[PDB]
Amino acid sequence: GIDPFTFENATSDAINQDMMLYIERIAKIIQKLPKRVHINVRGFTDDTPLVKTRFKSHYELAANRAYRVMKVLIQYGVNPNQLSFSSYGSTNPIAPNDSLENRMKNNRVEIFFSTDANDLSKIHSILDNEFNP
Amino acid sequence: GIDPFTFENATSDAINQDMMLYIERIAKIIQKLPKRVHINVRGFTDDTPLVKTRFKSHYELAANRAYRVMKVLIQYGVNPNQLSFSSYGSTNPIAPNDSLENRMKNNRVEIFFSTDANDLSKIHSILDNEFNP
């Protein structure tokens, strides 16, 4: 399956260089998709305390992450008309927050496609060509 | 009359220094509002034909105006977690699309507040404090 954008720094919204390149690939994929497909960039966090940062809440942290990924997709030519962003904060974890390994799973941004039934095949086919050799 | 933001020309998404000042004023207001109130930044166009611009459709234009305004609101300190943007293209004109003057009222971005009955008063006096005798 396709990978989400993982934030290794549990308390920041910083997009490093490896992640920028990956966002760029997804951007290239997105612009090839039919125009009636929209993209919702969703933001998540673990439950690491936020005390020594600027963020008041995990929602706020996840919003910044999703917004920033969205910003980057636009940088690489995705039309703002196909885009939106959402924050789920520390709700909806992939894994429980017991260990460092599982907490990384929770520090991510996920891409959601909004598509009809016919455009779903096209997305499927386009994603297959670019991601699986 | 708390006015929308009105763009300079039919096909432009440029935010002039005039509009910057006004968006900043709006950002100050938003930051005084209760945390449970959210802000949707709505973009519109007139129905001026789009040749000789980058934009392929009015929704792309309207989406770009609204995204830009939101990006500015954040720039001036508004929590991304309280923000979203929407494009309405040339739909929902506030005025008939005849004279240039009227077409321009349609080239605009509007701010919608999402609020419960109780936070509605808190928003009223905050807005009144800022835009009335």
Author numbering:
A (entry chain C), B (entry chain B): 119 to 251
From the paper:
The motility protein B (MotB) is a key component of the bacterial flagellar motor. It anchors the MotA/MotB stator ring of the motor to peptidoglycan (PG) of the cell wall and forms part of the proton-conducting channel that couples proton flow to generation of the turning force via an as yet unknown mechanism. The PG-binding site of MotB resides on the periplasmic C-terminal domain (MotB-C) which shows sequence similarity to outer membrane protein A (OmpA) and related PG-binding proteins.
The structure of previously unobserved crystal form (Form B) of recombinant H. pylori MotB-C was solved by a molecular replacement approach using AMORE. It contains a mixed four-stranded β-sheet, with three α-helices packing against one face of it, and the fourth forming an N-terminal extension of one of the β-strands. Structural analysis and calculations of the accessible side-chain surface area in Form A and Form B crystals of H. pylori MotB-C and in the crystal structure of the periplasmic domain of Salmonella MotB show that all five conserved residues are clustered on one side of the molecule and are completely shielded from the solvent by loops (β1α1), (β2α2) and (β3β4). Analysis of the distribution of the main-chain temperature factor averaged over the total of 12 monomers in the asymmetric units of the Form B crystals also highlights these three loops as the most variable regions in the structure. Structure superimposition shows that there are significant differences in conformations of many side chains and the orientation of the main-chain peptide groups in loops β1α1, β2α2 and β3β4. Thus, our crystallographic analysis suggests that the flexibility of the semi-conserved loop region β1α1, β2α2 and β3β4 is important for PG-binding activity of MotB.
